[PDB]
Design a protein around this ligand. Sequence first.
Ligand code: FAD
Ligand code: NAP
Length: 531
Amino acid sequence: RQPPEEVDVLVVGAGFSGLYALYRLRELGRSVHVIETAGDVGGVWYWNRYPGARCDIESIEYCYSFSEEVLQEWNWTERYASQPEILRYINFVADKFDLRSGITFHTTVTAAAFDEATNTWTVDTNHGDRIRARYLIMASGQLSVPQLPNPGLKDFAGNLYHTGNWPHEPVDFSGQRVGVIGTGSSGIQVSPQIAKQAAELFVFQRTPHFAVPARNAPLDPEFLADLKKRYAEFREESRNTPGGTHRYQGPKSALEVSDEELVETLERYWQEGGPDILAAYRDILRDRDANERVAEFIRNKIRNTVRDPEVAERLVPKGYPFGTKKLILEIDYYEMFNRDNVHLVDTLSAPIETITPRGVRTSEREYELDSLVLATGFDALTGALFKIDIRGVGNVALKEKWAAGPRTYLGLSTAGFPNLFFIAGPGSPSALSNMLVSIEQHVEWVTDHIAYMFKNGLTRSEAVLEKEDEWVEHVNEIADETLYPMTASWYTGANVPGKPRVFMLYVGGFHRYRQICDEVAAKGYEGFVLT
Ligand SMILES: Cc1cc2nc3c(=O)[nH]c(=O)nc-3n(C[C@H](O)[C@H](O)[C@H](O)COP(=O)(O)OP(=O)(O)OC[C@H]3O[C@@H](n4cnc5c(N)ncnc54)[C@H](O)[C@@H]3O)c2cc1C
Ligand SMILES: NC(=O)c1ccc[n+]([C@@H]2O[C@H](COP(=O)([O-])OP(=O)(O)OC[C@H]3O[C@@H](n4cnc5c(N)ncnc54)[C@H](OP(=O)(O)O)[C@@H]3O)[C@@H](O)[C@H]2O)c1
């Protein structure tokens, strides 16, 4: 629109988090406005328009629950929503509640500084706006700053793309020699799409990722009508799980079962499709021998999928425990490699030397290409904030405080930066659960908190230094009882050169985490000092 001078609560970003903050603060009777870089609402589902983009949580799980009207009216069509359909859903929710009048688009926040004189935040943008707001809510997302791989990039003659900043006009790869770098789920979702148009598809793999089949399906309209009858009930069940979905929590240890029961329980998971296998046994994430048992089964499934055993073996992920990078759902990605026009280039054995203007040189050879797609992921969890000059008490940069890894109390707040809040970021369950559930819980908790400051005539909320320190020690310690910290992944910050290695997330589970938050709020926000 045109942003106001002054406001109770300013919110950065218009994706699932932003929009919800906005609605609920209006419903709390507070003044609120949102600033967003993009052209319209959407967040990851506005930016990641690459062909094949699709969620790995079931449509019925990956949605809002705050609005009974919305559960009733909206019709999902598939087990997993593709990106254009999740975007229609966000647009449907935005029209419903007229959220757009609360949002300025095309505008990036560049700086923010806390003024101890007034207990208020002063916020700057790239258009020149300067806004003043008692509270700052960073809803700038976890996987919102695209990351380019590490020499010869401006030299490329052909066309160049990132999956996480995809053009709005569809792209035509017909005829072309095309390369994709990256086999994350971006890489793995967009390749089979490209392999349909192009004359030649080169997939540049570094470390192979474990992917299991999605087995997408139509969503039976009967089933949806039935669920609608019990919908709030259904979400409440998800809200009472470690992961925020209906995944079954395998009670047994993967070491305890026989070999034949392992093959059967797991085979049954492979036929069903989806990520639920992750919780097939309790210790897949807590014990290296358990994990290797599941890992090997899956590796053989990957071997069975391609005819040419030389290529197959290049696709088998090695050297890290199963599940310790995000688990990826594939749809016809492994079958793709049986096509004549698809070539797997291993950069574990022959690293990428440089990009030339014609293509990509490994040690081994040069590869000539007309178009190049980077599926190389994001500066995850801390990227978005690090692009912003944020300054607290004593004029400390957040960049300086968090330089050795994020330091938070509950992930919600950082000491020395009062009245500042982070939605679904480091210090909290974040992307280790269904993010609609993590996100809704944080928005309700932060915004309850704001409501509670106003009713009680307070104006300053800061996390206590020693309570933040204890939360950090707690997060690291529970991380270190699992296999997560063992492995380089975006969870750790490992795909950004020179980024500190630190498992950035709460691994306890959504459910414990919520409990802790409710106790904290119940006690009057213990661990915070309010004045
Ligand atoms: C391709 C993809 C698929 C995903 N699939 C799933 C899934 O399967 N399961 C699941 O649980 N989660 C999934 N996610 C994770 C995703 O982060 C969450 O599900 C959720 O959508 C994040 O919403 P958000 O509002 O918190 O952040 P975002 O959607 O990232 O919204 C942040 C917004 O803030 C904007 N912004 C950033 N900096 C500024 C600034 N300085 N000024 C103004 N605006 C700014 C960004 O442009 C962005 O639009 C996936 C993520 C990606 C990238
Ligand atoms: N189905 C879905 O819902 C979906 C879709 C897209 C994204 N997401 C979310 O967003 C996260 C990001 O997925 P993503 O595929 O975009 O990114 P990613 O998981 O961070 O994977 C990035 C990929 O590019 C490679 N890469 C990065 N830098 C490189 C370099 N300098 N040289 C060579 N190769 C390099 C990595 O190889 P290495 O492993 O060896 O680093 C990896 O293949 C996902 O885990 C998930 O949370 C979800």
